[PDB]
Amino acid sequence: MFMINILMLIIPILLAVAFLTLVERKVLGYMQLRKGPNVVGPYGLLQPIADAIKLFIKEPLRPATSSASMFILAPIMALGLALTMWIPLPMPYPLINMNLGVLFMLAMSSLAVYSILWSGWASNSKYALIGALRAVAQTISYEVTLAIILLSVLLMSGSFTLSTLITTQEQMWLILPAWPLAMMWFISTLAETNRAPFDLTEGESELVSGFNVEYAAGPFALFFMAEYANIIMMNIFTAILFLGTSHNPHMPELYTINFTIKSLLLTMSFLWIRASYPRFRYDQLMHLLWKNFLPLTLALCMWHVSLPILTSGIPPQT
Amino acid sequence: PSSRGEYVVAKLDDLINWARRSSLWPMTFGLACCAVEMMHMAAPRYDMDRFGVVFRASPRQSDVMIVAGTLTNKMAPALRKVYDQMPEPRYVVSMGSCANGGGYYHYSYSVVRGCDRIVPVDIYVPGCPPTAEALLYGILQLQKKIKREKRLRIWYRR
Amino acid sequence: LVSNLTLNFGPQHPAAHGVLRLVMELSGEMVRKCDPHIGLLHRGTEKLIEYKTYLQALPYFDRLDYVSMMCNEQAYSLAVEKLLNIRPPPRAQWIRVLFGEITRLLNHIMAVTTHALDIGAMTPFFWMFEEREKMFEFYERVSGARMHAAYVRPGGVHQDLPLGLMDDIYEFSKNFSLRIDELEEMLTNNRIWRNRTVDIGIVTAEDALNYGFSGVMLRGSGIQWDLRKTQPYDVYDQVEFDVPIGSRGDCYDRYLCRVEEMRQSIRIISQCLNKMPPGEIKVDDAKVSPPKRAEMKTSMESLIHHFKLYTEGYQVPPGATYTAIEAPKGEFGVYLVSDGSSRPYRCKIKAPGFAHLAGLDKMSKGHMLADVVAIIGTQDIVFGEVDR
Amino acid sequence: PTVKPPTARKFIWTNHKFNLSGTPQQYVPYSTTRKKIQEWVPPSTPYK
Amino acid sequence: ASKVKQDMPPVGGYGPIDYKRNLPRRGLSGYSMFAVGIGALLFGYW
Amino acid sequence: ASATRFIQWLRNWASGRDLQAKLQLRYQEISKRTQPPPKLPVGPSHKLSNNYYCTR
Amino acid sequence: TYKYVNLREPSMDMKSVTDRAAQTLLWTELIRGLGMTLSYLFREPATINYPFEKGPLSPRFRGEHALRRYPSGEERCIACKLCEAVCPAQAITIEAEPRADGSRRTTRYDIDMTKCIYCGFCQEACPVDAIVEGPNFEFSTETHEELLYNKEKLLNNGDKWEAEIAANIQADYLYR
């Protein structure tokens, strides 16, 4: 019954990533005064299937890889970690109920930079690596503020249990008391996943080749599935963290509906933002963190440690 | 149920063909003027993406090369380089007089008289430039050309 | 010379300007040397023009700056007319200003939107090519071709405006300022866009003139120079408009100048629609301009002139002229030499993009690699005219 | 065309045909001129 | 035949056409925006 | 043009403009595709007398 | 007459400084940019449903070439070679002779459609409206050889498209 419950989490994730690609192309289209996919299946509902079948029958590129082992680890590591990040999410009950769910998710996402680093080193092209190194410095940079911001929030929740975040926001969303942190959190999840205006990997491809340049259609398609899995998961986490739905233990499915709608609307705000702004230059997205977000994140971390004490509002430990 | 091998191969062939024509990611050499009409084929009025044809594709994920402008002798080696890097199945669409056969610089010393001297071409789109609608007709002709492929059916009878 | 990165836009992206091979030396993120290699769209156009009559050579000028089709035609026509010593009639001069400003709008939409598209701002590109698509219809209704009209010819224009065109142009112009405003709601005050353009590719006024720059590249640095105002050529002395002038000489001022030129073009188009006069469209002189198809099938003299005009062509008196116009990209000029026959002896094309691109190395000094994309975009380079 | 029918000419096609490219009815170019230089035909007579 | 029939503007000219930049100024002043933001924090903290 | 009033209010508010006054699309404010035949004028040299080419 | 595109001096009162501080920290202009994109999502797309819907053209449109006939059925072309002489791309090749009835008619009329620039000079130069550019723009082919038109092809195009071509000439011949 648990093996089933795992496949009731893995398979639906892959299908959501499949149909996020349709939703992305159609939302971008209508913001650009066009229709987007609407020919392959009714309203483009078969576009993801055609793209999927097309890529896996495509002739593979020539690996020409320096390290065969690290060539195959990178996609396996990326895909496996992306699926693993979903096991502690309370929707409203987690698949695995962890007492340190927040650290488990924070710790697991820190390993996601190995896929970037390995594939770049295994690519066998010198400009591919400098692409991977530039991306890694961006990923680990915006992890810093995510950890500190997450630390600040958990000082009003009182635990690392992800299901305790629901109880904290039973009376009111944490978006009110922590909107300065929700702003910098939301951006850092854009930069964490390498999304516009932070998708320097795709934008500067000609200047510096991206790390995923060497993989064939099938293997490259897997790198891409892991990347939207993270984007959906980081907005599900954004919803639980700052827009906590109320849980009625007799009607759990009502939580799952209201919860799901909030996850989509943030996930479609990623698409909304992609269609609205130009890209950052690399030294500018490093300036934004080390010289804007980090000073404010540290000041608000100091504030959110002092505030519970001076208002007598320290949350329970249990 | 009961089914022959011939029937199975015909249906699988229809599946892969439907996928390949439904998801045509084009690489575009915007060599000259004809690239401007290629850009109008992506703009709102025609919107090639609604057919499943992505606006921008990398050379090594592309399915079709669209040669939109004059191919000069200085540029010909680079175009053949890109063509070789493209993974199969690969198709070339020749757009406009210049690429089709040299056009209005056909008698020039610096111009390749047609891109079929460099790479194999599947569809020729006439015009100087072809209208965005004329290019769209050409791409839809490539989809029908792909629909009629019989790779599996031939393989069975080998 | 930490490393030399030979950047070929051979695998071209959705820009369509052409293809540029750029050879750079990157001492880290910074750029120390930039070396454009520009033979890839060289088609021998100037030599081919020597084997064509003056009329046969005109379509070559559509295909130079292939986003300024009717402005390139006007430069050729103004040069040939000057050697012929003839004058186009007043109605055609207004049609040539009217479509000269519709062409300026066409060019700046491509210039600003593809500049922004390269710097990641994809959406305004789609917003504005719905407008360019409506402008392409004006081109097709007067000439039959969406792009290469071949409409502006020495002596005037090929045909008269079809009935109902001026109303449709007015309807387009009435809604168009709002379209520009939407574009500025996404770029003018956007901090990301400003960070990518402000104080990038600065050019001093003194270095601009010596390097041969023209157009926005001068006016961004504060030089008060516009050929339409100082050396007017059609009816531009009869239309009121202001020249936008920059103050810092960076990309952001050049971006602002172009966006303000689009507004002044709509201002001019408004005056052309109201002041359009009646009359004929081509010089009433059949040894230069072909007669009407009705007269050619009725009159012996018209048939003879029709027969000779479309075979030998009109002969141009011997002489050499340098004619330049304020093209959207800059000063577009032709040095045209006539040996007295019906085919030009030499036709040298002065492309504003030729000098601007040569000035890239100067502008790129002390900038990151990602800035070079912004510098090339603000120059508005199309390789049809860079190479010819 | 219902309100404003096209003028009738006997040479105009009655059955419109669509693009025949890639089919056994496609158009194949060929020269429409007759031979220029005629060759002298040797006599069948053998006498030496 | 009939007097010349050409493409001409309607008698009286066309109506005025806007060309000037118009970005309408929206939103509350600087002071008000901070007060609304800070007011929300206090309500959330309370 | 066929947007309900609520959606009209929304997109007007988001952009800060009265979009319905200056719609991007064209409906029936465009010229008719069929127009009356023209009668174009003749040039200044269409004279039956005092029109010697040597003086122009 | 010139104007300054960017010569403002920012005000240095506290009220204005706070306005820019609020803008810098609260991302005001960035939200405004998000508003414009949101408005377009609820605007109607400009896309048309090709091939069921087509983009508007005019009578003057320059498309595929065809050779025309008189109402009686005789070919309009008299082999004057004015089109061949004018053709900027040298796309036209003509040969002629006296027909069996002594008429001045071509025996070869060819257009290399891959040389042609679709400029329409040949129809401007024809004295008898024999060569025209039709309204067809959908005739892309799979092989290069299918784009080298001989006389039969262009005569067949005239027979195929005469109904439309004649109406387009009727609509524009007065402008010409």
Ligand SMILES: CCCCCCCCCCCCCCCCCC(=O)OC[C@H](COP(=O)(O)OCCN)OC(=O)CCCCCCCCCCCCCCCCC
């Ligand atoms: C009583 C004590 C209580 C304690 C608090 C009291 C004081 C509270 C008032 C202070 C509020 C702090 C504001 C926190 C937000 C972060 C501010 C910030 O970092 O903005 C500055 C940053 C760069 O600044 P820059 O424009 O480059 O200026 C030049 C550099 N000096 O600009 C940027 O961030 C650029 C970001 C670019 C990417 C933006 C793309 C998305 C924009 C739309 C998202 C809308 C918000 C989404 C919200 C999601 C919520 C779930």
Ligand SMILES: C[C@H](CCC(=O)O)[C@H]1CC[C@H]2[C@@H]3[C@H](O)C[C@@H]4C[C@H](O)CC[C@]4(C)[C@H]3C[C@H](O)[C@]12C
């Ligand atoms: C990999 C995935 C198939 C996996 C699956 O559904 O099981 C397929 C389905 C749709 C595809 C996407 C879209 O079809 C097209 C997108 C547009 C750009 O070309 C980038 C790739 C792009 C983002 C594609 C990435 C990937 O190949 C996708 C996501």
Ligand code: SF4
């Ligand atoms: S075919 Fe015509 S439009 Fe295309 S590149 Fe050549 S000259 Fe330009």
Ligand code: SF4
């Ligand atoms: S349209 Fe122009 S290039 Fe084509 S055949 Fe006629 S004259 Fe020659």
Ligand code: SF4
């Ligand atoms: S088509 Fe016209 S111009 Fe050409 S040879 Fe025939 S009659 Fe003369």
